[PDB]
Design a binder for these strands. Structure first.
Length: 57
DNA sequence: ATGCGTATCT
DNA sequence: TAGATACGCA
């Protein structure tokens, strides 16, 4: 129920999955499927990817 | 029906 | 600042 905390370990797995897939295929559902984290939703990944893209600009 | 991207909210 | 929610539109 409490908001998801993106721990350095969880963010690292996100970064590795986003690096594995290219920019084209690094979409929230494919990231989530590859990350393989229990209880992690498409919306959790989508929100994180938005902030990640803003940080890379 | 599904899910991505942007804006907006807490 | 980070993470959640809303929604337009592919």
């Amino acid at each position: 129920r409490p908001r998801l905390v993106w721990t350095p370990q969880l963010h690292k797995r996100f970064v590795d999955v986003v690096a594995h897939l290219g920019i084209k295929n690094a979409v929230p559902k494919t990231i989530m499927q590859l990350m393989n984290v229990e209880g992690l939703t498409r919306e959790n990944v989508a929100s994180h990817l938005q902030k990640y893209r803003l940080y890379l600009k």
